[PDB]
Amino acid sequence: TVVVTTILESPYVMMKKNHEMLEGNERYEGYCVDLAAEIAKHCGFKYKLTIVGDGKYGARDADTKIWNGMVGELVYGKADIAIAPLTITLVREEVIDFSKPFMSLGISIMIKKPQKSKPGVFSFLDPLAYEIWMCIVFAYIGVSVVLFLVSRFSPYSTNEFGIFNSLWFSLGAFMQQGCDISPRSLSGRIVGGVWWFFTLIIISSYTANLAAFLTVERMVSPIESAEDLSKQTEIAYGTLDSGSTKEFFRRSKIAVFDKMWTYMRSAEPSVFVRTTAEGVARVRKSKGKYAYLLESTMNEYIEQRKPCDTMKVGGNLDSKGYGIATPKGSSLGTPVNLAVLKLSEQGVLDKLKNKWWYDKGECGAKDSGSKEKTSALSLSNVAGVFYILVGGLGLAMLVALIEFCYKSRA
Amino acid sequence: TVVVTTILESPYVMMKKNHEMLEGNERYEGYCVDLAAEIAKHCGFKYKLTIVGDGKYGARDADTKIWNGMVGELVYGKADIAIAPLTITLVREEVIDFSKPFMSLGISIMIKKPQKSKPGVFSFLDPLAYEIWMCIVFAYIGVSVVLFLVSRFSPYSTNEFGIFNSLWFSLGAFMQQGCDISPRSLSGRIVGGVWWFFTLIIISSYTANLAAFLTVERMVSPIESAEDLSKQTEIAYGTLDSGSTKEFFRRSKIAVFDKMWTYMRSAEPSVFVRTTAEGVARVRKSKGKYAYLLESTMNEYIEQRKPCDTMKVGGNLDSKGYGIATPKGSSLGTPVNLAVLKLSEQGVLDKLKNKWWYDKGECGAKDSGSKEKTSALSLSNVAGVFYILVGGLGLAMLVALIEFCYKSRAEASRRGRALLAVALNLLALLFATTAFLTTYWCQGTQRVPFQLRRFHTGIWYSCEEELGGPGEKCRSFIDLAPASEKGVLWLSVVSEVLYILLLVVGFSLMCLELLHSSSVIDGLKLNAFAAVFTVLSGLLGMVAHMMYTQVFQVTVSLGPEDWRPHSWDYGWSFCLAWGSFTCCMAASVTTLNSYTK
Amino acid sequence: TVVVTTILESPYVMMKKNHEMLEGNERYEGYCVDLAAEIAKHCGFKYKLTIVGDGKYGARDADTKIWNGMVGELVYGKADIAIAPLTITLVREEVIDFSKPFMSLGISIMIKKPQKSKPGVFSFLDPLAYEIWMCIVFAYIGVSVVLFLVSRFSPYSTNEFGIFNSLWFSLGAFMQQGCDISPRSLSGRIVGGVWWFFTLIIISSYTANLAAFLTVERMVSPIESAEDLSKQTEIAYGTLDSGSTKEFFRRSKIAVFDKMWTYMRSAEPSVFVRTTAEGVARVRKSKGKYAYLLESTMNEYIEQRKPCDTMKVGGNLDSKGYGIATPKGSSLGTPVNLAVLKLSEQGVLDKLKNKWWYDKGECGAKDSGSKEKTSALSLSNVAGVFYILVGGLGLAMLVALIEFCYKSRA
Amino acid sequence: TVVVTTILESPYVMMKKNHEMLEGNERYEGYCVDLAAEIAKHCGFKYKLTIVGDGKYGARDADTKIWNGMVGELVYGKADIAIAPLTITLVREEVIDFSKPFMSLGISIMIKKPQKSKPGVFSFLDPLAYEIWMCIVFAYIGVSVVLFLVSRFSPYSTNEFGIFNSLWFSLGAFMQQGCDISPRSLSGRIVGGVWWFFTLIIISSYTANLAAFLTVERMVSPIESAEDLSKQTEIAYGTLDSGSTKEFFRRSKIAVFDKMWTYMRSAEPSVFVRTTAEGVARVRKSKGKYAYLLESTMNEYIEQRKPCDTMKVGGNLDSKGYGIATPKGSSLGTPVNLAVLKLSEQGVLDKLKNKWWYDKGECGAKDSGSKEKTSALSLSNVAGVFYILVGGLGLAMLVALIEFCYKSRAEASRRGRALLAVALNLLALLFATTAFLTTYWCQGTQRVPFQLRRFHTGIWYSCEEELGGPGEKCRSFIDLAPASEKGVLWLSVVSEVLYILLLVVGFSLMCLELLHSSSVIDGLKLNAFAAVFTVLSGLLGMVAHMMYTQVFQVTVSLGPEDWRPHSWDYGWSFCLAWGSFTCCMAASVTTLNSYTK
Ligand SMILES: N[C@@H](Cn1oc(=O)[nH]c1=O)C(=O)O
Ligand SMILES: N[C@@H](Cn1oc(=O)[nH]c1=O)C(=O)O
């Protein structure tokens, strides 16, 4: 027979529902089970689908020079061929030969899907920017300055609009509760006129834009680039402990990628993982503190799988290739390479790809977006208003303290 | 004697009301039972009625290649004729014989009807949670008392800011209608100007969230056709376990129909149902999260029976016909087709039709009541505002009678004020310290998949009752929270202790107010700093309960897994925690009133 | 050869782009061109695709007993077979034989797609129902009644809150501009308290729901049933002047359908049409005044065609069937009937149907719905407010007239 | 001497700045030109540079089965070697030879970059059209004058409702800040209570429509991937007329890629472009309504050159490689592959890379400036409110200087009031009747597909200028409108005539006001009914222009086809129509002022 080594990875290698019932080539499902069947039909060999006994993709110790996983089995004669998610690298090219890329891909970043956070303490003042709020208070004092200059100039006996009253009238104008004082001057009432039309826009601007936040919500990704990871060590990130992606960061010559691999080895609670299926649960059970780096074609299946708790961010860090790994000088190097050509000529590999990623894609991205909710405001939303309420109350207590005693002094 | 087979499917074949009382042909009723006597009327044969032993129409299976159910009786020969809700299909045509289609139908889609709009009497409280509506009211009492302190202390005379008037100032400030009395002390202007910035955020938050509801209330997308059903996985799709409908979606090749059949294939759990009466029952209980795809003539009848809460959506997906079936090559099948054409010529089929569906219509008139398309508010949506309005008129009517009776009784002391001031403060001590010592602030239940665990928690110990007895396993709440939110929870426990100790300074200085106590000379300034510290008690204490429920609600959503409650309801002695805060100011208004006179 | 009669109807019969260039079986495109090719392959006959010379589907004069169109040609020997949109009726069954229904369908209603109308004069008061607005004014007077009863009872000299002032204070409370008068009674201030919380909900209810209208718009169909047509003669409606749909309303025994056919013949500017392609332009150029009744499969193509100016309303009025019309006693009755079976056994007719209606469906319903617009309020929206403004102004002039003269009288 | 072919594609092969001044190899530059000298450095051959005569890379066609463009030179033999932006593809592999892929790339998607947010200085006027903002102002003048009439006539004394104060009452009523002066006459309460119900609808309409913008401003769906491009036909998709990208979408079989290729098939007009520089140019001019799908390395360079207004969206759809190509079986092709590996070993390819893309970066730093995600208002969005604010301060500063200079000049008649009252009324006659007689109220242009027709219309005649000269073909406007809206247009023409005739009663009764006229005795009541009829002039006249523009804007959208303007702009003598209405009250305030003294 022909021993085919495939690492157990969904959706390339799947177990049957009665997996202990069936044996061999019937037990396994997925994309490589399709491709090993489609290759052996146009090449004529008896394929035996075997899980790799070591369990790994394949890497060499740099000191003892010993490959493990699927790579060491093909060199040392145990496995006959590999039709599996193996990535064509230069170090793998020197020991075995690869077919043409039947699938294109890229290394991506998979984070825990950022749910709506607890709002900030001062998240009530979100719908106006801080560039506005400072310029409001500057215009709040600045308008109230002008009304006192006007009030001193035109007496028409006493000027009720002192500077102690002008901030009060500009406040009651801004806070929608008009005060009983009113300018009796044309040079006054134009200021009180234009300051009213100030608030009528701004309060309507605040009321409108806050309805824009509560209706249409956009859960922001805290990280969306390779720059976003290396500049901030707040979220951990890692790869598999025996994989070509880990091989990529070791031999990387871009300094950002070099900054990653220096951080990957140095600060260690256990960053690297044994399995991709380990790395999925390392994301989902870390609550935003872990972002597993893996292939985009690996990540497009997890995004279209229950419970769809993860998302892609950014994009491909580099281009790569998937190939059927044949041993060096094998008999079925040339017929498999012609089979990789011939199945890709008919679009058989494309009619496989648009089936498997899509018919299982029951969490199509519409189901998360179109499921909006009718949510009341919790106390977390406007909590900081009560804080500055009491923070205004205790400030009023201290002014009532000092102004009583200064009149006792004077 | 001819054997007649069918299945118990209302409205077509119905069991009688008293199945044991009656015998033979009198054991069953319905449309098809009325049809079967008409067939024997024209063809002159004794007919023996039977029911299938399986309880399903059935079709041939993959491995066994044998017809089961009703068709298996027809193909093999266990029955002589089927007068039954049986779809003529080409896979059924090649195995046995059919008549002319007497009843036309199509595959329709049954969802549960969109439920009646019952907004409730408190539907206007929907944008802001009830936690906020309390904390508005307790802060409404807070600012008016502070302004009643500030007005009496400061010289800035006569005072227009009495405790009756100061609550009228903050109610004028909160409802945006303003007030004619203006704060003229600077310390009075601070306490007004902050409460103004309070009510401008809250009302704008109330308007914005109410607009955030009704925009989403219009983008509900009331799914009508199967194309918009195929584009949505919020609602499941199930049919009968083996019928003509499941086999229709099996050998379909339309891209809409294939994409549903792939969704029907990977069913976790199995969406297909055993019978129609079970299949309609899942629609009754899943509340519009499940859709049952059935034949339209069954859909029209079940629409017309109580609770009438199932609605047809869209049109027929296909066009099929019911046929009275005989086995392959029987001699009786040709006068059967002549009999079906005979009642078609007489119009007795349509006589059986409009008799049955109309006289057993229970509720009816669905297109009559649904002429209205609701897009505005109903009166019911703001009805509780009217009920508070008409009620608040009637309460204030009773105030006018008693106040005039108080004025007529006025036509017909300070040691007691100090006695009532300490007595509320001794409650406020007893109400606050009970809250801090108890652990029953939050009554909720958490479960494992069907064992639930009733438990209560506070600031210190989350005491979970363990089943099999009393339980009461208590775990520390402080390290229980996640750590970034924990620092606020550190600050709240400090502030709640700071609330108690400043209250201890409060009522102990109320003890010096007493006439048998320290002095009459220079005691009014001791009443003054007592009055300051009771306001400074409850304000710092209210923040401690603000910071509790904010951090607590984080822990309910984002917290340690292997425990998640279903209810985060606020238990007793949280009510007493606010009842402490109520009695803090309610004694402080007394000692301000005793100070000013 | 075998003369095939097909009425020229898209998407069943289409003309090529260079239609004058090619001849015969290459000139024609569409669904019946597929089906005539798929039938003649499994039956073995030379098909000639001919347009019917008279141009019609087929109907008989009830007096001279002469069929025309495709039906008269099959009876009188001119045409050999019909693979065309012909509907199996009882009167057509007596003269020729039909195959099994290769396509199911129903008679539907196609209206001009109702664009956003000019708004009403009083369309500003839409977000609150008339059941509310009457009960507001009843509660407006009703609250103001209570405050005058309170004001007369408790004197604490003069009662400023007369009935002439209490409607004014309840108005200024309702219209967000608080008046300088204020109750000095607890039995007063509770009424003024609860009436303020009345408006604060209602004005927020009006502001919120009006944002619901301008954001999410629902263009309502004025007619959506067969009941909706016969009860109101505001919109005209008709069928083709020689067709089985017209044959259906003549022999109809449901009184609603009978009410239609009585209206179709009686009130006539020219209701019935010669062509379905005539009936499409009769819809699009009538501006809502015409609703062409035709088949659902005819209507699913027009909805998925440029410029998608029409929509289905309601549903199928009845079930029908499409059949290949063979002459009575023909040779190719049985092989075509077996061909209609055999092509439907493989799902060939279904893989034709999901292609033609869908690959041309470039106006998929998403393109109309997801294209929302950022539209300002025109003057048509709030026009009636200015009308009742001046309508309030002239009423103020007349009260200023009569109250001056009555004090001159008294 | 070896023939080198390529195509002029920046940044890879660029023509020099002075193409006629330089000769031979010095006629071209770029990345690949720098590469070609390095190839001849390692392999030692004289290289002759050529450009394809067609101007495209090309591929084999269906009918002819021949390779054209660059590959046709390679397959046939017209060139010796191609060092060119040529994608290695299996259909290109079987016909000629390729080297090792030196540059990795993928098919990217170029849309125009989302344009910079320039809200304008009047962005706060966006929810309400400028027609409304005028009609608010003219009704603001309307109600205050009416209230100034009502206050002087009625006894209800001293009057606190002067014409300066009455405009301050309505400005307090419109801005919701209220006013301390209360209307106490019942006729004064009517005119206040209606204007209150005015300003409550308008401000709530202003807040609701501004919320209606910003909700849609957040559901813009900024399309990033091709899947969300495949789901949207608002934006077209085009590639080069014959390249590796179009052939990639041709023989693709992915359901996303097939659905785009079916959309690319039925192109009306043809979405495919001749070259890249033309293809990027359609993206520059179609303003985000067109998308050009090109290779990502070209996308990175064109992103970095001015105006830098094209942005990459999503990632690569595929993974491909550029290859230096030789014909099938040439002996030179193996040292070519050794040369490509040699510069790969040296890293001179990456030396050519980071030299070229970085030093010819014009704007750069796109991820640096786009760190901010705008979700709140900028200062620019309400900037014109500040500019009116700071400006309205500075205008009112100048009022204080002049009014004190007026007071200092006060420290240092009634026939003239009546003279100014008639003179404005004689204008108001001349301003109104000019509007009714002219037909230039609406200046717009309508077109046939490229001939435009400038025209002007009014209430009576829509006078269209006919080209080839002056034209002026005039058609009746009254029957021109649709008929249900026409009845309002009937009422407006009646009201505008009613506006003129009541104004005729106005200034003719102003003639009796004159001192040389009828009498001094009992003339004040003749001044009174004159003053009533001038208010009753402009109010009924304003409705006539309200009903015009409402019915006119219907006719622009819903009207007789074969004519539709692009602009419905309001021409002159519509401005004079409001200028009549301004002068109606501006004379009426004079005769109220002359009456009260
Ligand atoms: N599969 C890749 C490497 N790899 O795959 C993962 O899912 N993680 C990871 O490092 C290989 O063939 O070496
Ligand atoms: N096609 C039908 C009749 N018909 O088709 C239309 O599109 N209108 C209409 O009356 C037939 O076969 O007679």
Curated annotation (Swiss-Prot), chains B, D:
Induction: Down-regulated in the pyramidal cell layer of CA1 in the hippocampus by global ischemia. The modification Phosphoserine is found at S252, S286. The chain crosses the membrane at residues 130-150, 186-206, 382-402. Residues 207-381 are extracellular. Residues 161-176, 177-179 dip into the membrane without crossing it. It is found in: Cell membrane; Postsynaptic cell membrane; Postsynaptic density membrane. Residues 180-185 are cytoplasmic. A lipid is attached at C179, C405 (S-palmitoyl cysteine). The postsynaptic actions of L-glutamate are mediated by a variety of receptors that are named according to their selective agonists. This receptor binds AMPA (quisqualate) > L-glutamate > kainate. Belongs to the glutamate-gated ion channel (TC 1.A.10.1) family. GRIA2 subfamily. The M4 transmembrane segment mediates tetramerization and is required for cell surface expression. This is Glutamate receptor 2. It comes from Rattus norvegicus. The chain holds residues 415 to 843 of 883 of the full protein.
